[PDB]
Design an enzyme around this catalytic site. Structure first.
Site: not given
Ligand code: M0M
Length: 500
Positions: A274, A292-293, A406, A408, A411
């Site tokens: 996550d 994550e969402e 990928n 981090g 955004a």
């Protein structure tokens, strides 16, 4: 042609095949268990422990909406009684649900907007779907919510900063709790904890929100129609000592890298990453809809981590074992769509947990791109990923591969190639193989593969590679006078090793 490179994914360790024999499930000072372990049986709904509701209202436990200490001004009244009176009314229009939720949230009657909810019910759903929502799904949700004291009988401790602690609870208990979160019943939650009440899901104009709503109702329909039978573990893990990266003599592990597939579908039985916010779940109960969402929507049992998981410090992570997938989707952010209901086929371990392990590791947000090359920042990411990957007291033979991508990037302004190597080093230090999904970027797959086999064939250690990262910083980034450096990381590494 080639969709993947490296070690065949078939050759990577997965649960349950690689798994340890689990010790007997039992409550301890660092393990809260909220069910009857002596009655735990495959295919049977777990029985809460204890039998009768016990309440703790303090700064170390969840404040339950059914507590006798949850009061409202009338003289003090019982807000739990107010909650039952408000929610035990027929709904036939979205205004009716808004008005119900606001009866016990009066301070918020002008602050909380319900536009997304109204638009969902009125302007997105078919009339027949709207009818099923208010005749069946919402009343079934109220009922499981109001059943909280018979279901969630045992106080739930907060996973606070610096605690190394586990909570194992039933999927049923979670359903009860999440139905409460939907109806915004959790008291005193409207500062170092994420949001848990779902009020921000209902607000604003947004085309994401209907899709979020559809995903969550798909879950709510399933678990109120027929109780899930398994358990879920949430473990906050906090390490004190981190590797001396420059001295680390361990070899790199194996790598499979592919531009097709997903962590969640193609990384079954593996440690699934996550790409977390430090507030676990990120924008799941509000506006966010990226990796994550999405994961918290299609596996909504993850969302309850927000009830009890304090913001992650630099040396911490959250490990969640046993969440079930209830939805499929397509797209992300503005193109995210709920597809259909998903029948999770995962085997369950000896604790009746789905053989699905997810770790929340939050990367840093780099407003300036070169900042992430600063040793302190590289070490920070290495240690975050390492904490997320390490399982103290387990042999490497019994550790699944890490399934990641990928981390981090997007955004948060991470460099994909730097972060790949960071995750490769952390995994190597934790003695795990890596399965890396580039999410359509075939050039990135080829680059990561090439660098990985290059370092492997030359037998560089974790420490060797880390030293090269420091050389990159010292020669190309530190006294760099432009937004990016003269020479890119991987080329620099190739030239530096080929120069020896
Ligand atoms: C399911 N899934 C998945 C992603 C990845 S990278 N992987 C490997 C994956 O399995 N991104 C997403 S949505 C956000 C897109 N951004 C792409 C760049 O990175 C940061 C985030 N969903």
């Amino acid at each position: 042609d080639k969709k993947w490179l490296g070690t065949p994914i078939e050759e990577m360790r997965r649960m349950p095949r690689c798994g340890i024999r689990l010790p007997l499930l039992r409550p301890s000072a660092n393990h809260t268990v909220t069910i009857r372990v002596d009655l735990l049986r495959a295919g049977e709904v777990p029985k809460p422990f204890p039998t009768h509701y016990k309440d703790l209202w303090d700064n170390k436990h969840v404040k339950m909406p059914c507590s006798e200490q949850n009061l409202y001004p009338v003289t003090a009244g019982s807000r739990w009684e107010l909650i039952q009176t408000a929610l035990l009314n027929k709904f036939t229009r979205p205004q009716n649900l808004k008005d119900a939720i606001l009866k016990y949230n009066v301070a918020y009657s002008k602050k909380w907007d319900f536009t997304a909810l109204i638009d969902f019910w009125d302007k997105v759903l078919e009339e027949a779907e709207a009818q099923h929502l208010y005749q069946s799904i919402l009343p079934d949700m109220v009922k499981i919510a109001l059943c909280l004291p018979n279901i969630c009988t045992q106080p739930i401790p907060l996973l606070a900063a610096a605690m190394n602690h586990s909570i194992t609870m039933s999927q049923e208990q979670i359903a009860s709790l999440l139905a409460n979160a939907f109806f915004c019943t959790f008291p005193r939650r409207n500062s170092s904890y994420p949001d848990i009440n779902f009020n921000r899901l209902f607000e604003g104009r947004s085309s994401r929100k209907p899709e979020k709503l559809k995903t969550l109702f798909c879950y709510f329909r399933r678990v109120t129609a027929a109780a899930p039978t398994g358990l879920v573990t949430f473990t906050r893990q906090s390490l004190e000592d981190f590797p001396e990266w420059e001295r680390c003599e361990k070899p790199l592990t194996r790598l499979h890298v592919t531009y097709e597939g997903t962590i969640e579908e193609n990384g079954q039985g593996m440690l699934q990453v996550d790409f977390a916010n430090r507030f676990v779940g990120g924008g799941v109960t509000s506006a966010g809809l990226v990796q994550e969402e999405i994961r918290f929507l299609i596996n909504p049992e993850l969302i309850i981590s927000r009830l009890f998981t304090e913001v992650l410090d630099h040396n911490e992570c959250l490990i969640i074992t046993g969440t079930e997938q209830y939805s499929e989707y397509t797209g992300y952010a503005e193109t995210y769509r709920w597809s259909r209901s998903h029948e999770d086929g995962s085997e369950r371990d000896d604790w009746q947990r789905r053989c699905t392990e997810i770790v929340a590791i939050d990367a840093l947000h780099f407003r300036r791109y070169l900042d992430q090359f600063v040793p302190e920042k590289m070490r920070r990411e290495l240690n975050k990923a390492y904490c997320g990957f390490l399982r103290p007291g387990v042999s490497s033979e019994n550790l699944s591969a890490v399934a990641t991508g990928n981390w981090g990037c997007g955004a948060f302004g991470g460099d994909a190639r730097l972060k790949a190597l960071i995750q490769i080093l952390a995994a190597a230090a934790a003695e795990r193989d890596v399965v890396y999904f580039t999410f359509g970027d075939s050039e990135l797959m080829r680059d990561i593969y090439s660098m990985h086999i290059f370092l492997t064939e030359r037998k560089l250690t974790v420490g060797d590679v880390y030293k090269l990262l420091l050389r990159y910083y010292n020669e190309e980034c530190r006294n760099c006078s432009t937004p990016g450096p003269d020479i890119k990381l991987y080329p620099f590494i190739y030239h530096a090793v080929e120069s020896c």
